[PDB]
Structures are given as C-alpha cells and as structure tokens.
Design a protein around this ligand. Sequence first.
Ligand SMILES: C[S@@+](CC[C@H](N)C(=O)[O-])C[C@H]1O[C@@H](n2cnc3c(N)ncnc32)[C@H](O)[C@@H]1O
Ligand SMILES: Nc1ncnc2c1ncn2[C@@H]1O[C@H](COP(=O)(O)O)[C@@H](O)[C@H]1O
Ligand SMILES: [Mg+2]
Ligand SMILES: [Mg+2]
Ligand SMILES: [Mg+2]
Ligand SMILES: [Mg+2]
Lengths: 388, 376
Amino acid sequence: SEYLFTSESVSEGHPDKVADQVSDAILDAILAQDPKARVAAETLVNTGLCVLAGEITTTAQVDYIKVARETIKRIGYNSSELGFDANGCAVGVYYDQQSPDIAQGVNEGEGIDLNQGAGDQGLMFGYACDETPTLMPFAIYYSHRLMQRQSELRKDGRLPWLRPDAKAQLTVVYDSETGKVKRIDTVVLSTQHDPAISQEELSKAVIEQIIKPVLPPELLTDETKYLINPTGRFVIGGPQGDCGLTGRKIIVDTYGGAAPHGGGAFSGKDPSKVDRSAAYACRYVAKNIVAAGLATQCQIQVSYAIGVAEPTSISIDTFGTGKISEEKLIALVCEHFDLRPKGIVQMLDLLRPIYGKSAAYGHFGREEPEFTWERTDKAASLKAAAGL
Amino acid sequence: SEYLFTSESVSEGHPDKVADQVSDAILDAILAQDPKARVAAETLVNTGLCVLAGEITTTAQVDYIKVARETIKRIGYNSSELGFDANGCAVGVYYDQQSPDLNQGAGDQGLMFGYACDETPTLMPFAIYYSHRLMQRQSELRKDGRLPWLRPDAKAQLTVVYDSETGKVKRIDTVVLSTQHDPAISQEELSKAVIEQIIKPVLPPELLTDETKYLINPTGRFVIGGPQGDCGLTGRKIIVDTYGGAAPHGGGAFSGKDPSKVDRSAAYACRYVAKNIVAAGLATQCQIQVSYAIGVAEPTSISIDTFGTGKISEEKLIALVCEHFDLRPKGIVQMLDLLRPIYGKSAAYGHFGREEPEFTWERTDKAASLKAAAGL
Ligand SMILES: C[S@@+](CC[C@H](N)C(=O)[O-])C[C@H]1O[C@@H](n2cnc3c(N)ncnc32)[C@H](O)[C@@H]1O
Ligand SMILES: Nc1ncnc2c1ncn2[C@@H]1O[C@H](COP(=O)(O)O)[C@@H](O)[C@H]1O
Ligand SMILES: [Mg+2]
Ligand SMILES: [Mg+2]
Ligand SMILES: [Mg+2]
Ligand SMILES: [Mg+2]
C-alpha cells in the first residue's frame, strides 16, 4: 500500500559543487561583458588545486584566476584551518578556443539550416508535479532546502561552528494508490564543523535549527529516523577531503531521480549548449502544463542533433493524469513554445549573467527572478487554448 | 498510437570516455596487485593534457603515467596532429595516496537505480543497446583499417518510435552519427560509408524504412576532435553508462571507483536484481531504487516498480529480493566477486547489456531460484 523513495542534496561547500560554482562564476563574468560568448568551462578541484579547462571564445576580458579564487572564498574556503584555502590554492588556466568545426554548425548563416544549430546532440528531460508549492518532487525539493538552511546559518554566524561541506538525504513514504506523500521515513544530515563542538551538541542544534525548521511538521512522526553525522566527526571537507569536478551532481541539480536524466551537465555552459537551454525549456514547459491544471504530473523528453535547429524528437508523458491526450499536448506545446535553440534563448532571456545562483541548491524549483524557466506565465494561455 | 524516445552513446575516443577509461585502467592495474585497495581516481583530459587526481589507499606499485599513456595509445590518439596523443601529452599525477565484516557501513550516502526489460536479447532498452553497438562498429572499422580515415572521437543518437498501446518498437525514426575524420575525405563519401558500412549492418533492417532520417556530421566538418575540441572528465557519461534515459539515475559515477563504493557496487547489484527478476519471468519491466547512509550497512530504502507488468506484487518482490540478495556494501562485493581487475572493459560502450565474462552483474544465475521461490 506504500513505497519508499529517496533523494539527496549537497551544500555549496561540497567539492563537486565548488567546481560547478567556479564554472558558472566564470560563465557569468564572461556574459556580463559578452552576451554572445561561447563558453564550455570545466573545473577540477583537489588539494590546493583548481584546474580550469575547456573551450571559450569571447571578446570578454576576464581574470579567470581572480574569479575562481573569489568564488572559492565566497563559498567559505578562506581560512587556514580548513586546509583548502583560496589564498593557498593553485589556479591553472588551460582553456582552448571553441572548435571552428563546431562553431560553423552553431553560428547562424552557416548551418545545415542556416539557423542557430544545437551546440551538440543529446537528450534532455523536464518534469513537474503537484507535490510542492513550486511544482517539484518532494524529496529533492526539501533536500535542497536542508542544505540551503545549513548554509544560511553558517554564513550569518548563527551557528558559527558550521563549516562549508555538508550533505542531506531524505527517504519519504508514498501511498501506492494515490501517489501522495504520507510521511518522512529517514533524514540523513552530515555537516562539516569546527572540532571544538561535541557530536551531541551538533545533533541537538542540527535538529532544532536545520531539520525541524525545514521539513513539514505533520510528516515527522515517532517512526522518523534521524541520522546526523552518522560516522561521527566531520572536521575536514571540501576539496581538501576529496576531488570535485564540474557536472558530477547532475541528479542533485535536477529532480533527484524522480525523473530520468539525459546525461548533460549544466554549469560552465553558455545557452547555445542545449544540455542547459533545452533542459531549462523542458522544465518551463512541464511546469506550465501542471500550473495550467492540464496534468498533475508531466514529463517531457526532447533531443537534438549538433548543428541542427529543430529538435530530433519530442515526447510528453502525463502518467494518466492528463486532462487531454498527450498528442494534443504536444500540439499545444509546439504552438506556444519555440524549442529551437535560438527560440529558447529568446523565450527565457538567457544571454545574461544569471547562472551563478543555479550552481548550488538546484536548478529547478526556486522561483527566483533570475530563473525564468520557473515562471508560470504561459499557464493561463495553455489552459484557455486547451478548452478549459 | 505512437511516441518517440531517444538515447545516445559515444565511442571509446570521446574525451569523457577517454577519462573514464584511464580511470578504470588505473583501477584495474591497482586491483591486479592489491584486490582490497581503495581507489577514487578522477581524470581530466584537454589539449595535450591528462590530469590524474583523487585518493588511493593501496600496497600496489603502479606506474600511473605509463598506464594512462598505454590507454590513450590503445584508444587511437597516436599523433600530435590530433591535439592529444599518448607519446606526447603531459600526464600529471596529483593523487592523495596513502598506504593502508559483512556489516561494514557504506562509505557514503546516496541513491542508486537498476533496470531491465524484454526489448533486447540482453534485457536492455532498445535505444541504448543499439546506440552502443553503432559506436562499437565505428571503432571496429577504424581499428582494422576498413575505414582508415576514421579518427577516434564519435557519437551516435537513435530516435525510436514505440507503439503507445503495446510498448513495442515499431521503427527507427532518426539516426544521428558524428565521427571525427581525416580532412582528405569528402562529406559525401563519408556520409555514404557511415550509413552503408556502420549504421545499416548494426540496426535491424525491418526497423529502417524510407522515412528513417540519417544525420551524419551535421555541422559539415569533424576534423578537430578529442580533448582538444572538447574537454573530458571522469563521470560525465553516466546515462550512456547505464540505460540511456530509459530509467532514472542516482547521480554517482562508476569509473575510477573501487567496488567498496556503493555508487558503483549498488548500481551493479540493482542491475543484477532487476535483470534476474525479468529473466525469471516475474515481470517484463523492472526498476529498483536503493539508498544508503554513510556508516550504515543495510540500505536506508529499497523500492521496486514493475510498471503493471509484475506477476506478483511489488511487496512480494521486495521480500524475495531481501531473501535472495545481500545488498549490504560488503555483501554485494561477495555476491558479484568484485575484488578483481574486471573494470577497464566497462568504461566504454556501456556497463550494462554486455554479457562479457568480467560482468558478473549480467549473469542470470538467480532467475530460476526466484521463479521457484515466487511460487511460479
Ligand atoms: C559538440 S562537443 C561540446 C561543446 C564544446 N565543448 C564546445 O566548445 O562547443 C561534445 C562532443 O561532440 C563531438 N564533436 C566534436 N566536434 C564535433 C563536430 N565538428 N561535429 C560533430 N560532433 C563533434 C565530440 O565527441 C565532442 O566530444
Ligand atoms: N565524516 C564525514 N561524515 C559524513 N560525510 C562526509 C564526511 N567527510 C566527508 N563527507 C562527505 O562525503 C562526500 C564524499 O566523500 P567521502 O567523504 O569519502 O564520503 C564528501 O565530499 C563530503 O561531502
Ligand atoms: Mg563527487
Ligand atoms: Mg552530452
Ligand atoms: Mg562532456
Ligand atoms: Mg557520489
């Protein structure tokens, strides 16, 4: 009559997320000067190490080393006690230019269709459902918020012993018949901390200040299991502790496994990379379908060929909850959304330095003004055009 | 009455796959000397560059640079004209390396998925299965000189049409294939050879129709390639490595990780569980999710979905799985004989769906016991 489902998130101090944030800070710095820049910025962080590699073609003049160090400092890695310290980190720049063989497919006036072609082949999924106020699956939505809360309390000093690296995991119970959340089964929360605080003090504060204020009280019961720093002390973390790379948190970045993923990473990529722009568009489409009341769950897949503007495929699944057929939904989507690469960029105003905030705590489910793919401004037109 | 679904794969020369293969070649070299080693070997490749970083605990003595160069050589990067070559690139070793029970706790939290279905002989989804085979065929004809103008880097993408009622594949709608090439061959000659000698020998003829669209090297040129054209990193092909989008993913990479790491061992176990449930005729579609907490042995969650195809309830299946499989981290290692150098081959053309002798998670040796224990 019920089943379990689990998602996780990590803080901005997790080493993979450090790499994502460095990649998107560099992207933002470039786009602030050159909105049309071609950016494919990959980052690897390790002990004392920040390698910047990939392909960038831009008129922007950005001090990549300074931007990387300032990003690492803003995350919290700015003191000798943490091991990994921006001031004591080697930043090495290895960027190439964008390959001209790729550029001639993407550039307008040079495509097989002379339109802006997709930056790559690939497949992308979007998803929305009615489980949370921002139309996200429950477990990833609240896992992100646990990690945001950890960072909030650290950065304003209310829990001054918190350190940057942390992880959270939620196992939730669903009703097999209704698909509705019944209760929270397990909360895992691990946080880095100053060595002077005891594990007992830490657990009390994590419960009072992080777990209880974030999760819905009605879903925490006598059966809920709390696993706080379950292997004990967590003093060293970040890239002193383990290696981080761009694009190694793609499930955290999206839907926490509540929907399939096409494989493409987001951070460090300008919007001509459909890995980013089309995944954002798919979230926008699915969210507006659910907000229009046309389905209570909606999943979309698209795909592209490098150097081709029209998607090679589109498919929509409402899991039996759609008020109209999925064929009619695809027709509505194609009428109200331009999923060609240039059409997406125009639809979502993507040639702007709006990406740094997306690189931790999830790309989806936060109704921040930067995140145009979270607007539900097409829902009314979809509902009307469906005949509802 | 119909819907579309798309998956992709990449060749062993794709820069992300180069990184995966270097990571797992180093893992194998370590495991051959020290089966109990802890390995978390990450690789980044770019123009003239192979960075090796991560954490290793072992008694093995491995020449990591030589292993990396040998792996790059085997893949086919043997000229600096390509911007990346085995003899000439810089290899830099940054590992944090140190010298150095069924209820041992997991080494991390995390979630993992497995999947199986009846669409292909090895119980894989159609689109990923044949996307892999397209890329294996590209590499085969390059290496044996049948198409000597091929270069190592390549990608393929299949869009398939499914019947909305029966769920069966009806036809192939679009084949995308991009392959790096010697500048001397025209696009017209390249396109014809890819279609006639790579694509058509691999895909089922009855699924290729006059409506099938072939998009070959659609930018018009693919001479620059490899890590120069596109930086590669370990763990950036996790959907190619698994089910091509036909099932969700927990997020963790496989390559460079020793089998104590549940990101890899539990995903392999979930494939093993799902494939045996299908092989036993208990379902035609089966998806499983597990998760772990750091320091805890038994998974924090397990769930199974047969998408209405199951012959017993999913509750009954979960009970069967707990009785017939040991999903504790050390129990998986024993179940699948994982403390051996068996991983280098997994790092290109998919971890699932090939019944190689190394791939113990592809054995259906529990199907009969599950079919009997289910009462069927
Ligand atoms: C298109 S690149 C990703 C974007 C790239 N980093 C950039 O700077 O725009 C990803 C993969 O596409 C393939 N690729 C590279 N050049 C290509 C070309 N000219 N045509 C088709 N595929 C290409 C290679 O497999 C490469 O690893
Ligand atoms: N003592 C610890 N307890 C819980 N989580 C940790 C601890 N140390 C590190 N982590 C987290 O776990 C991630 C994966 O690496 P590992 O520390 O090996 O599990 C790290 O990047 C940290 O986010
Ligand atoms: Mg990681
Ligand atoms: Mg991709
Ligand atoms: Mg890549
Ligand atoms: Mg992991």
